[PDB]
Amino acid sequence: NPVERYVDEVLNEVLVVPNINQSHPTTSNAAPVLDAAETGHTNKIQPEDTIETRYVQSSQTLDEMSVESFLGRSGCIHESVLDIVDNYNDQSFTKWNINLQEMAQIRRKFEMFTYARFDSEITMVPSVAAKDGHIGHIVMQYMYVPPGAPIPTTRDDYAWQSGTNASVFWQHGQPFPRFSLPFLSIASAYYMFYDGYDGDTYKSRYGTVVTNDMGTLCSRIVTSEQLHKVKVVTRIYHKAKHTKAWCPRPPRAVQYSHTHTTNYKLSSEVHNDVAIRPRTNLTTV
Amino acid sequence: NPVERYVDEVLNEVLVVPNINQSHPTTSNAAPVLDAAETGHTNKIQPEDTIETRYVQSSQTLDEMSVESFLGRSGCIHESVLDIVDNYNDQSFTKWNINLQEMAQIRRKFEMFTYARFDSEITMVPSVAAKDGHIGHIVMQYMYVPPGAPIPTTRDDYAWQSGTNASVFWQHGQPFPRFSLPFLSIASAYYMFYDGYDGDTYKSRYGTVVTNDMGTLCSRIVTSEQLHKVKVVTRIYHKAKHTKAWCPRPPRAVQYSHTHTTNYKLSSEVHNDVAIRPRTNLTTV
Amino acid sequence: NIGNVSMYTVTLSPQTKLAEEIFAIKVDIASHPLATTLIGEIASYFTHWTGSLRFSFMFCGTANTTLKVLLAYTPPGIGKPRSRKEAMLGTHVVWDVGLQSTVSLVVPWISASQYRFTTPDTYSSAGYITCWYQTNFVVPPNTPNTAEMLCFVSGCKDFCLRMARDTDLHKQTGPITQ
Amino acid sequence: NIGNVSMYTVTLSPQTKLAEEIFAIKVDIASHPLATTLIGEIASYFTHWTGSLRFSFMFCGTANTTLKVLLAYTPPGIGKPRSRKEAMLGTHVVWDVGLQSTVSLVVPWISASQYRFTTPDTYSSAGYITCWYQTNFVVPPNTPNTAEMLCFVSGCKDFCLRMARDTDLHKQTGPITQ
Amino acid sequence: GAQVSRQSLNYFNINYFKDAASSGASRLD
Amino acid sequence: GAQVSRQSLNYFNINYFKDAASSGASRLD
Amino acid sequence: GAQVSRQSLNYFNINYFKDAASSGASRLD
Amino acid sequence: SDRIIQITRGDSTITSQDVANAVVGYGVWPHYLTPQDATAIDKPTQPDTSSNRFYTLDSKMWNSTSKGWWWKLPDALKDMGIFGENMFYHFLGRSGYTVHVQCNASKFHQGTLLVVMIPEHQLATVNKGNVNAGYKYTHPGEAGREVGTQVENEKQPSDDNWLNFDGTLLGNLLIFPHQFINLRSNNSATLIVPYVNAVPMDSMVRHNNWSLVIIPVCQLQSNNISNIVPITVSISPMCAEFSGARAKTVVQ
Amino acid sequence: SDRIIQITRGDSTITSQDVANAVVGYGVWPHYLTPQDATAIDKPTQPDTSSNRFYTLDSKMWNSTSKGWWWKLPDALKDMGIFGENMFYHFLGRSGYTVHVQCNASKFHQGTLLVVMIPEHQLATVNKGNVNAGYKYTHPGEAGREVGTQVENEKQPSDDNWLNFDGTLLGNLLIFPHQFINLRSNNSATLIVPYVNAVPMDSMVRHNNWSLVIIPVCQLQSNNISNIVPITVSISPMCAEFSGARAKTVVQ
Ligand SMILES: *C(=O)CCCCCCCCCCCCC
Ligand SMILES: *C(=O)CCCCCCCCCCCCC
Ligand SMILES: *C(=O)CCCCCCCCCCCCC
Ligand SMILES: CCCCCCCCCCCC(=O)O
Ligand SMILES: CCCCCCCCCCCC(=O)O
Known part of the structure; x- marks a missing residue:
């Protein structure tokens, strides 16, 4: 019933975690704890198998852990700056080759999957800094220029x-x-990673740059030159709606250095490059 | 009927107080006025038991005295100040460890119960003071940073x-x-009081500080540096919705001195520390 | 007595003069000394009040100490009674101390208006409750010549508060820091 | 070891002292060294966690190497066990290495509160998991005298994360350019 | 989200957002 | 665009724009 | 809060707030 | 007779021929944790009669200058037989209690004790800034605390009985489960309290759920002062169950 | 597989991939005392999972000159968590046990341990007249007794493994519940024994019901002697119940 399902949406109880059942002492030649990791499979042993548990009714839900929830939060992907310094004609407009690779925060979340398909919600937050005092009447134009x-x-x-x-x-x-x-791709999903080239020569491009062209965003202060100079910073926020993701992968362990590439840099002391905090020894908790 | 119940909501007559019935003179060996406070129980004697009352139809309601009503009013819990004095980069952002212990007015009402469970409505009232004359275009960002x-x-x-x-x-x-x-707690209710520690040593913390961590609120003036300095004061208002409270307790008799603790200070003349006005003597009304 | 538990007890003792006054306070729910009681505190969070009040008194003398006291409520429109005879003409209960320690006097809702102001207001002053010796505090030899009495207060089935307001029984004269 | 595959292996060898400790770590899902494991990473994207953890250990010695180890989980409210006898009093599994290489120890959800904080919090510290020699690492002649052991971690049927937050396991200290 | 009653005095108890916390003050017991 | 359910607890799942991308977050499977 | 009449000339006498004082001018007797 | 009472718990039976009824805190009788409210998944140990029995604490002397006494539960029973052992061997614990305060004098004595059971009685410090009561001071064990006797230490809690040791007025303590021991009418007080907490089970070592406070509101008086009038407290756990077994916690 | 076994008791789980079946002493699985056979009239306390769990004793070293080892139950567990506490706080106690002896070597090692569970193993003294084994010597605790290591005291029991420390021939020990740990076939032995006694419950402080005796009948041999081969014993009480609660007995 869509109404009962509706209530589940409101209470956030669409996906419930199982209960813990009461177990008892056992003496058997069937040992669930023993298995073989070589198989590539995870041992599905549960708490009832290793200890004597009580019955507990679970009331936790996995709704918030859904891909829609995980990727369905608006994060900044770009900070467009129009700083009128000495030439209005030149400084009043700009362009940006659209991508989700410039801000580490959101990039890392999407990159936990190999392919992802989703619609995008773009919210813009413009802030006009009155460098000389007044801002006048600021009217902006954001034009989406598709490739071509x-x-x-x-x-x-x-x-x-x-x-x-x-x-x-x-x-x-x-x-x-x-x-x-x-969903803007010419493919069925967006490539988060692409082990390919746009050709077969030594000078062919590698990676997602070959597949992920979303066009250009061209900004402009529509208002003509004003006496007082202003600095307009427009922050672009992106949220994924109606998301689907395939083939999960390890999280980025080191810092990102460039767009469309997994390239990284290491220092002489690599422990400073990863989030791993050095242990004194195996027994020091 | 939800509609009849609806009318009650509009008229605020959901909980009606009982009537006073007509009583008569009595001469009995059953004396309701006599009882024993030692039992820990309150004598439920009513006006009809001590005097000859008339019949009166009560039209008063207890709706406004409900816990939802009592705690369901927005009160200020914090005053965030961003005063640009001499360094924009440093003075344009701030943080606040969230709590309902800093403003006596609302703190005292919640503290009349030992445990309370409720949802929160947060309204913010920002006011930009033009210290130098103009304010330009002020855009604020309030980010909720959960612990971690x-x-x-x-x-x-x-x-x-x-x-x-x-x-x-x-x-x-x-x-x-x-x-x-x-409701943000990891427990079933918020601890208004907590007679416990986060450890068993002499240096272990005591009180609600151990249990009530709601994270940090980080504010920032999104707008870049402007010619004219401003002082932005953002007042945070909190209202409890869908409230439940357990184990009522005595109201705070003295002033609050610190957050998360019942600590207080007394002067040499304690009568000045409490709301009790000294009597001349027992017979002076 | 403020700052001592003694501020909660009234002392009784053998009298030499008959019909002496023991105590006298205002019936007004948010007036002193009713203000800091739980009902007074809650009442201070509202603007209007109505209903009857229940005053209880527990005798704490020895099991061999006897006493008869007259508890009276004087409705408004007159001053507090100057004598027991004057008090006795109003609402009252003659309390005989015995096996059962506690007695209750109910202050009926006797008012022109349906509600009264919680804050001290001339037009809405509820009256006075006085206590007098009906007979005397009598004891056998070798028994303490004074005894304490505790006083309680609560609302009857028809007590009701209206119009929420901030209390004046607590203040903040500075920032509450960490 | 950081920056080497060796940081993932624990070495076992013939002991001369009985009941020696092998390793000891905190059970806290987002603490080190659990932080960079997939479950630790995902957990760092949330504020609250709950449920039981599944720790698996695979023996990588020769087919002729034998060993019995005791894996214990010490619930909170006490320090990490100083000895095998101390550890043994808590939740534990005695692992006999044989034909099947891997064993699993389940850390049951034993807590006062339904959820615990993902970030290191005193009030919500989950406890410790220690490993001790139950007997000894025994080998025939002409067999390597040391062997490696791999450790895995995953969540049980009742693992659950709550309250999405940004991770502290990755940062951006500059602009990501083209 | 709309709780439509009828009596006509039709009552609409709409809930504009999908999260329970979003709703207003509660009804009395 | 309105998906009206009844149970009365009537549910209106309105879609103010004619493009699927315009709608909000999706329902769980 | 909606008083729906029918005659079609359907009349909706909506009351946007839960307090009686919130409503507009009264009807004549 | 309504004046008599007999309470049997395990191997202990307590009597009183002059009672003033009994009080069941918040009207809820103690009971074991249900699978609906439970969180810890291991099977709870329930000692039963070996745990749920009356433990008599150290007697106190009541005299004209006494200001009051207080004990914290489960702290007061940490050294009481099987119950004590269990609270240290397990991380989690849960329990209800039957508190029986005893005090007999004579028909020529007068005095009144206010016996209260306070949930989450978070103590305060006076004029010591944000320094809170030290663990040691809020964990006196069976000896409890005699109000107005200690030569203050920085982490020493408040001794202001009129301010409930926490900044609230004494007269309002009656909002919590309580009884009075008025020497002219009763010689004991009985309070049965359930488990009250925001979590189903908790650490008994670091969290004191209830606090037994006894304040003499009416001074002890008689013409035979040489005869000592003690106050004895017997507490009996109820439905005590523990979880998360391991080694015994030793507090320093 | 018939070679594998997993034993879960309380919060402990023990495994072995090379077992030789298990033995249930006298074919009776441990069980609680019935009202038909009971004598003590008070309600028994039954700790359950906090008591009935595996306790691992101190490991022993098995080498070419080892003569044997023995432990007495419940004595060996007197200091083991909740079970230990209970046996001292109560006059009476009753319990069954799961004994799991562990010993792994290699396919190039050989040796044979005879693991036996003896009921009422009343030890003897040799050439000491009618002087019997002293309480201290028959109550070694978790450390047990290493046969042929002690510098005799008058009250020192017999160390004659071939005479079962009581005047009977070793070869006939097979009449009692037992198993063999033959290094070429198994790496552990499992014995589940019920409560055996002429009385329904007894004092666990003065009466040792069972005795775990381990005698190496076939010397440990290999070409890699430097590698130490230990013997570890894990015992788990079953259906442990106690009666007659009082103060804790301190033995001197
Ligand atoms: C409830 O869960 C959905 C809330 C929908 C909000 C829109 C309410 C207005 C509906 C008007 C529909 C008119 C019917 C013809
Ligand atoms: C769906 O595809 C069309 C969306 C129409 C938006 C308007 C919604 C409000 C409808 C109110 C109608 C009231 C019914 C009498
Ligand atoms: C009355 O008590 C509730 C008032 C609700 C205000 C919303 C009115 C608009 C209702 C539109 C519903 C369309 C029906 C499909
Ligand atoms: C015009 C505002 C920005 C719109 C971005 C939507 C397209 C996202 C495609 C992500 C591909 C990538 O950069 O790896
Ligand atoms: C971010 C705005 C503030 C939100 C506060 C809601 C949390 C209230 C918890 C009260 C706990 C306390 O401080 O005692």
């Missing part, structure tokens, strides 16, 4: 007309802009 | 990405931010 569409080279470029491209206009004072984007 | 999550050490710390933590962004001019928080 002409990228504007000036703040008054004809590409800004957005005859076909999607543009979001934000007027300072109004609530934060937000919009959704369907 | 990395606490930002700079205004541009990576922790601000909020890849998983809940963050609330407020843009000056928009209505006051507000959100709800589920």
